[PDB]
C-alpha cells in the first residue's frame, strides 16, 4: 500500500531541477505495457517497444543491433548496467531503470548532461526496488 501518488514521484523526484537543468519528459511504465505514471509531453508508447526493452533486461545486449524504439523514435543503445539500466543516444537521450515490477524512463535533451538524467532516474528506481516496487 502506498499513499504516495505516482504522479508525485514524476513531478517532484524526476522533473526537478539539477544544476540548472531539467528533464524533457519522464514516466513510470510497468513491466506490463501499461504506464503507472507519466508527464504531460511524454510520448504514447506501443506494446512492441516495452516487450523489446524487457527482453533486453532478461538477456543483456539483445536490443543493440536493432536499437531502442521509444515512442517510435529510435535511440542508439548505450547499455550500461546489465539488467539494471539501459540508456539511449539519439543526439537528446533516454535512460531506463528496471525496478522489480516497473520501469523508470526519463528523456533528457540538451543542455542536460546525461549523468544528470541518470542519477535522477537511478535514484527513483532504487527507491522503489527497496520498497518492493
Amino acid at each position: 500500500d502506498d499513499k504516495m501518488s505516482w504522479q508525485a514521484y514524476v513531478d517532484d523526484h524526476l522533473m526537478c531541477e539539477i544544476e540548472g537543468n531539467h528533464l524533457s519528459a519522464a514516466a513510470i511504465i510497468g513491466q506490463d505495457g501499461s504506464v503507472w505514471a507519466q508527464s504531460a509531453n511524454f510520448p504514447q508508447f506501443k506494446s512492441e517497444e516495452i516487450t523489446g526493452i524487457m527482453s533486453d533486461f532478461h538477456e543483456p545486449g539483445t536490443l543493440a543491433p536493432t536499437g531502442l524504439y521509444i515512442g517510435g523514435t529510435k535511440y542508439m543503445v548505450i547499455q550500461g548496467e546489465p539488467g539494471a539500466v539501459i540508456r539511449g543516444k539519439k543526439g537528446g537521450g533516454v535512460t531506463v531503470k528496471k525496478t522489480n515490477q516497473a520501469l523508470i524512463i526519463g528523456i533528457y535533451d540538451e543542455p542536460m548532461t546525461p549523468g544528470q538524467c541518470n542519477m535522477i532516474v537511478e535514484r527513483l528506481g532504487d527507491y522503489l526496488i527497496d520498497q518492493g516496487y
Partner: antibody
Amino acid sequence: EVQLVESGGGLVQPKGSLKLSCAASGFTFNTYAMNWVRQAPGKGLEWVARIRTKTNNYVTYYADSVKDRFTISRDDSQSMLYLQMNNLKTEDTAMYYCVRHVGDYWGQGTSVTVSS
Amino acid sequence: DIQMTQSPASLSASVGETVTITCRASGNIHNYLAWFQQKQGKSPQLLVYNAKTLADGVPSRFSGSGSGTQYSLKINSLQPEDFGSYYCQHFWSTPYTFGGGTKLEIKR
C-alpha cells in the same frame, strides 16, 4: 499485522563485540531493504547502516563512525536482519532500531551500554 | 555527505497555533525527505515522506513543503497529540542524515 522485533542488546565491556538482531513479521523481507538507526541515550537519532535487496546485490552501506567497526547482514530465508558491532567504545552507547526503507515501520528498540 | 540542519531546536506553542519546523540540507536531496514524530519512550512514527506525501493515518494539519535544500513541516491548529520530537531524514545519498530535532511543548 506488520511487526519488527529486536533483541540482543545489553551491557558490553569496551574492546568487546556485539551482534544485534531484527525479526521481521507482516511483510516480505526479500522485497524491502532494511536499515539500522541509533539514538544516543539523551542525544538525537543517527543513521548507522543500510543493506539493500538481492536485486541490488545486497550492497551494504555503513556510516563513518561505524564504517571500520560494524557489519550488517541478512538471512531472508529465516526473515531476520542482524548487525555485528565490534571494537565497542563508550560513544557507541545508544538505542538501536531496525528501520524499513524510509521509515514507514520501525522497531521498539534495544540499547547497548558500553560500561565496565 | 549531505548533512541536515534542523530548527527551531525547541518550540513552545498553545493549542491551535501554527508552527513550522524547517529542515535544510548540505545539498539538493530532490524531495527525498521524511518527517518523524517521536513521543518519549516510544518509537518514531512517519508523518510525512517524500517531502509532501503524508503517511497513512497522518492528520491533515501536518504539512510537507519545500524543494532543493530548503524544506519544512507545518503544524497548523496544533492538537494535544502533536507533542514530541520531530526529526528529518534525507534519502538521496548515504549517509542518510538526520537533523537536530525539535522538542514541541504544546501548552494546553
